[PDB]
Short mmCIF file of C-alpha atoms in Angstrom, two decimals:
data_model
loop_
_atom_site.label_atom_id
_atom_site.label_comp_id
_atom_site.label_asym_id
_atom_site.label_seq_id
_atom_site.Cartn_x
_atom_site.Cartn_y
_atom_site.Cartn_z
CA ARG A 1 1.65 3.30 -27.55
CA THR A 2 4.78 3.26 -25.37
CA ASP A 3 4.88 2.73 -21.61
CA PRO A 4 4.83 6.22 -20.01
CA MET A 5 6.62 4.94 -16.92
CA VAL A 6 9.60 4.12 -19.16
CA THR A 7 9.65 7.59 -20.74
CA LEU A 8 9.28 9.20 -17.32
CA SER A 9 12.10 7.10 -15.88
CA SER A 10 14.49 7.88 -18.74
CA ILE A 11 13.81 11.59 -18.15
CA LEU A 12 14.53 11.25 -14.42
CA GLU A 13 17.66 9.18 -15.04
CA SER A 14 19.08 11.81 -17.42
CA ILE A 15 18.54 14.39 -14.63
CA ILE A 16 20.59 12.19 -12.28
CA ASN A 17 23.34 12.01 -14.93
CA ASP A 18 23.46 15.80 -15.11
CA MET A 19 23.39 16.24 -11.32
CA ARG A 20 26.15 13.66 -10.89
CA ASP A 21 28.24 15.63 -13.44
CA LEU A 22 28.16 18.87 -11.44
CA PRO A 23 31.41 19.89 -9.70
CA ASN A 24 32.24 18.35 -6.29
CA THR A 25 29.09 16.19 -5.99
CA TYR A 26 31.34 13.11 -5.26
CA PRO A 27 30.14 12.60 -1.63
CA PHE A 28 26.52 12.43 -2.76
CA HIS A 29 27.09 9.80 -5.45
CA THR A 30 26.90 6.83 -3.07
CA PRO A 31 25.37 5.93 0.33
CA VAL A 32 27.19 7.21 3.42
CA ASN A 33 29.56 4.59 4.87
CA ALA A 34 28.38 4.01 8.49
CA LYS A 35 31.86 2.70 9.41
CA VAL A 36 33.63 6.07 9.00
CA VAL A 37 30.98 8.82 9.05
CA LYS A 38 30.47 9.20 12.78
CA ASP A 39 26.91 8.72 14.10
CA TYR A 40 25.50 9.38 10.62
CA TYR A 41 22.46 7.06 10.75
CA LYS A 42 21.63 8.09 14.31
CA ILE A 43 21.39 11.71 13.16
CA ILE A 44 19.99 11.00 9.65
CA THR A 45 17.08 8.54 9.88
CA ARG A 46 15.81 9.15 6.29
CA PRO A 47 19.03 8.91 4.20
CA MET A 48 19.27 9.44 0.44
CA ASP A 49 22.00 9.58 -2.22
CA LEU A 50 22.22 9.62 -6.03
CA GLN A 51 22.89 5.88 -6.30
CA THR A 52 19.76 5.09 -4.27
CA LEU A 53 17.78 7.63 -6.30
CA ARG A 54 18.88 6.02 -9.60
CA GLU A 55 18.00 2.56 -8.23
CA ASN A 56 14.54 3.82 -7.27
CA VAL A 57 14.03 5.33 -10.74
CA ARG A 58 14.94 2.05 -12.47
CA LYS A 59 12.59 0.18 -10.08
CA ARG A 60 9.73 2.45 -11.27
CA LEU A 61 9.08 3.90 -7.82
CA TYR A 62 8.39 7.49 -8.95
CA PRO A 63 5.06 7.98 -10.76
CA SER A 64 5.56 11.76 -10.90
CA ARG A 65 8.17 14.47 -10.60
CA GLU A 66 6.93 15.33 -7.09
CA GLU A 67 7.97 12.03 -5.50
CA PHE A 68 11.33 12.17 -7.28
CA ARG A 69 11.98 15.75 -6.17
CA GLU A 70 11.04 15.05 -2.53
CA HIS A 71 13.70 12.32 -2.28
CA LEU A 72 16.18 14.61 -4.01
CA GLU A 73 15.46 17.47 -1.58
CA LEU A 74 16.20 15.01 1.25
CA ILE A 75 19.80 15.01 0.09
CA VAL A 76 19.98 18.75 0.79
CA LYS A 77 18.06 18.59 4.08
CA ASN A 78 20.26 15.75 5.36
CA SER A 79 23.40 17.65 4.41
CA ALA A 80 22.07 20.71 6.24
CA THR A 81 21.43 18.56 9.35
CA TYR A 82 24.67 16.58 9.36
CA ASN A 83 27.16 19.05 7.85
CA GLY A 84 25.38 22.32 8.62
CA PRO A 85 23.04 24.68 6.77
CA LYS A 86 25.91 26.77 5.34
CA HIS A 87 28.50 24.04 4.88
CA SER A 88 29.99 23.91 1.37
CA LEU A 89 28.62 20.36 0.92
CA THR A 90 25.09 21.65 1.61
CA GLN A 91 25.60 24.33 -1.04
CA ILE A 92 26.78 21.58 -3.40
CA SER A 93 23.70 19.47 -2.73
CA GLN A 94 21.59 22.59 -3.38
CA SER A 95 23.27 22.98 -6.81
CA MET A 96 21.93 19.50 -7.67
CA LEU A 97 18.41 20.44 -6.55
CA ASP A 98 18.57 23.69 -8.55
CA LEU A 99 19.66 21.91 -11.75
CA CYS A 100 16.82 19.42 -11.25
CA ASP A 101 14.26 22.22 -10.95
CA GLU A 102 15.56 23.80 -14.16
CA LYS A 103 15.37 20.50 -16.03
CA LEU A 104 11.83 19.81 -14.73
CA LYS A 105 10.53 23.27 -15.68
CA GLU A 106 12.19 22.84 -19.10
CA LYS A 107 10.16 19.63 -19.62
CA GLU A 108 6.98 20.82 -17.82
CA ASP A 109 4.50 20.00 -20.60
CA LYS A 110 5.79 16.54 -21.51
CA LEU A 111 6.09 15.56 -17.85
CA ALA A 112 2.50 16.61 -17.21
CA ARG A 113 1.27 14.52 -20.14
CA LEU A 114 3.25 11.50 -18.92
CA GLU A 115 2.07 11.90 -15.32
CA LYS A 116 -1.60 11.97 -16.28
CA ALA A 117 -1.08 8.90 -18.49
CA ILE A 118 0.57 7.06 -15.59
CA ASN A 119 -2.21 8.09 -13.15
CA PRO A 120 -5.26 9.21 -15.17
CA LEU A 121 -7.62 9.18 -12.20
CA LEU A 122 -5.42 11.27 -9.89
CA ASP A 123 -7.63 14.07 -8.43
CA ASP A 124 -10.31 13.10 -10.95
CA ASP A 125 -13.56 14.45 -9.54
CA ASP A 126 -15.60 11.76 -11.36
CA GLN A 127 -13.73 9.05 -9.46
CA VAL A 128 -14.11 10.89 -6.14
CA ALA A 129 -17.84 11.43 -6.74
CA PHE A 130 -18.33 7.81 -7.75
CA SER A 131 -16.61 6.58 -4.58
CA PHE A 132 -18.64 9.10 -2.57
CA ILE A 133 -21.99 7.64 -3.60
CA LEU A 134 -20.78 4.04 -3.23
CA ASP A 135 -19.82 4.81 0.35
CA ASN A 136 -23.26 6.34 1.01
CA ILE A 137 -24.93 3.24 -0.41
CA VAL A 138 -22.91 1.11 2.05
CA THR A 139 -23.53 3.23 5.12
CA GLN A 140 -27.07 4.44 4.52
CA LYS A 141 -28.66 1.48 2.72
CA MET A 142 -26.65 -1.72 3.25
CA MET A 143 -25.70 -1.21 6.91
CA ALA A 144 -29.31 -0.22 7.70
CA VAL A 145 -30.55 -3.76 6.90
CA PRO A 146 -31.76 -5.19 10.22
CA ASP A 147 -29.45 -7.71 11.89
CA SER A 148 -26.73 -6.92 9.32
CA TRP A 149 -24.15 -6.35 12.09
CA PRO A 150 -22.42 -9.78 11.56
CA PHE A 151 -21.43 -8.52 8.09
CA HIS A 152 -20.18 -5.08 9.11
CA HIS A 153 -16.68 -6.32 10.00
CA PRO A 154 -14.50 -9.32 9.08
CA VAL A 155 -15.58 -12.65 10.58
CA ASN A 156 -13.99 -13.27 13.96
CA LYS A 157 -12.05 -16.53 13.51
CA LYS A 158 -12.12 -17.24 17.26
CA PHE A 159 -15.91 -17.71 17.29
CA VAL A 160 -16.45 -19.08 13.78
CA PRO A 161 -14.42 -22.28 13.49
CA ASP A 162 -12.51 -22.99 10.27
CA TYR A 163 -14.05 -19.95 8.56
CA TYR A 164 -10.83 -18.87 6.83
CA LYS A 165 -10.25 -22.46 5.64
CA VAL A 166 -13.76 -22.78 4.16
CA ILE A 167 -13.86 -19.23 2.79
CA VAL A 168 -10.91 -18.39 0.55
CA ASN A 169 -12.12 -14.83 -0.37
CA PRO A 170 -13.62 -13.29 2.80
CA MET A 171 -15.49 -10.01 2.46
CA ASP A 172 -17.38 -7.64 4.74
CA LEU A 173 -18.79 -4.15 4.59
CA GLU A 174 -15.87 -2.53 6.41
CA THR A 175 -13.46 -3.97 3.85
CA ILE A 176 -15.66 -2.71 1.01
CA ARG A 177 -15.62 0.78 2.59
CA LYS A 178 -11.83 0.61 2.82
CA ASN A 179 -11.64 -0.35 -0.87
CA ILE A 180 -13.96 2.56 -1.73
CA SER A 181 -11.71 4.95 0.16
CA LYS A 182 -8.75 3.79 -1.96
CA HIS A 183 -10.87 4.15 -5.12
CA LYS A 184 -10.68 0.44 -5.96
CA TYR A 185 -13.97 0.55 -7.87
CA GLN A 186 -14.10 2.37 -11.23
CA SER A 187 -17.52 0.98 -12.03
CA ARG A 188 -20.36 -0.76 -10.33
CA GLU A 189 -19.37 -4.20 -11.69
CA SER A 190 -16.30 -4.64 -9.51
CA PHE A 191 -18.17 -3.15 -6.57
CA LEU A 192 -20.92 -5.76 -7.04
CA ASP A 193 -18.31 -8.52 -7.31
CA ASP A 194 -17.29 -7.80 -3.73
CA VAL A 195 -20.86 -7.27 -2.50
CA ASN A 196 -22.00 -10.60 -4.01
CA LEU A 197 -19.09 -12.38 -2.21
CA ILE A 198 -20.67 -11.53 1.19
CA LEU A 199 -23.73 -13.52 0.18
CA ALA A 200 -21.80 -16.30 -1.62
CA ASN A 201 -19.58 -16.78 1.45
CA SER A 202 -22.58 -17.04 3.78
CA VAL A 203 -24.18 -19.62 1.48
CA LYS A 204 -20.98 -21.69 1.64
CA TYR A 205 -20.54 -21.59 5.41
CA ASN A 206 -24.10 -21.15 6.76
CA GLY A 207 -26.08 -22.73 3.91
CA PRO A 208 -28.88 -21.22 1.83
CA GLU A 209 -31.59 -21.27 4.56
CA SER A 210 -29.66 -19.60 7.42
CA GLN A 211 -30.95 -16.36 8.94
CA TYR A 212 -27.47 -14.99 8.15
CA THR A 213 -27.82 -15.88 4.47
CA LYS A 214 -31.27 -14.28 4.34
CA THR A 215 -29.77 -11.10 5.84
CA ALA A 216 -26.91 -11.17 3.32
CA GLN A 217 -29.44 -11.61 0.55
CA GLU A 218 -31.26 -8.47 1.75
CA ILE A 219 -27.95 -6.55 1.79
CA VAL A 220 -27.31 -7.63 -1.78
CA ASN A 221 -30.88 -6.81 -2.86
CA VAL A 222 -30.85 -3.34 -1.39
CA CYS A 223 -27.48 -2.68 -3.07
CA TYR A 224 -28.85 -3.66 -6.52
CA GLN A 225 -32.06 -1.70 -5.93
CA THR A 226 -30.12 1.46 -5.05
CA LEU A 227 -27.74 1.17 -8.03
CA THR A 228 -30.84 0.80 -10.23
CA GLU A 229 -32.47 3.91 -8.72
CA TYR A 230 -29.36 5.97 -9.54
CA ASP A 231 -28.53 4.27 -12.89
CA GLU A 232 -28.39 7.49 -14.98
CA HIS A 233 -26.16 9.30 -12.42
CA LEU A 234 -23.86 6.31 -11.97
CA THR A 235 -23.64 5.63 -15.72
CA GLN A 236 -22.50 9.23 -16.34
CA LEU A 237 -19.72 8.91 -13.74
CA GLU A 238 -18.71 5.46 -15.02
CA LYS A 239 -18.53 6.70 -18.60
CA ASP A 240 -16.39 9.70 -17.62
CA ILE A 241 -14.01 7.56 -15.55
CA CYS A 242 -13.59 5.04 -18.39
CA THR A 243 -13.10 7.62 -21.12
CA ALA A 244 -10.59 9.56 -19.01
CA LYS A 245 -8.39 6.47 -18.63
CA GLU A 246 -8.26 5.87 -22.38
CA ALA A 247 -7.86 9.57 -23.28
CA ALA A 248 -4.88 9.85 -20.93
CA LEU A 249 -3.16 6.92 -22.66
CA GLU A 250 -3.78 8.38 -26.13
CA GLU A 251 -2.11 11.69 -25.20
CA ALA A 252 1.03 9.62 -24.43
#
């Protein structure tokens, strides 16, 4: 019932404590001082240090060990580039990376359980499959409605005066496809919330009798009809997505 991001961040912060405690890590404790380390930020355009890593941990920027380790490995790579691949400082930065990898392997199982609770739908095939059919509904059914082209992309403000003053939540099929590609929709309800906005917005701006509103109504109707045709399939995916979220949290 605890926040897994907190448990993950305490684990990462204790790794920084141990890395900071290794012999001769002093130069990696704080950001490089541009005023005395010649040309450093010309040569090193992606800098990293243990102070910045600890700040990032406390800001909850790492949802997994991978993102934490990639920033840590930057410390080694930057030392190799600026000091040299065999410089003693690069060997010292490598001793920090090696300790980290021992600590992470040591806590493999608990970290895995926390990572899945922080991101239950990561590489979840039910979510990918659900987004896959939503996208097909948009491209094969909704965009095939005749004269639907004015809804395929955001309204062009230059030709539609005051649109973005009248319409506070604009929506269009390209934006819905972008949301699908980021897996915004975990069930058909939030998908339909955005689809219905295309019609509601045309009613507000064009009125209920407009040819554009009739077209939007057909887009909405074919969306509902297609969700209904695939109800059993979609319900299975929705159920699996929902129960995976909650199961991930329980294993925390």
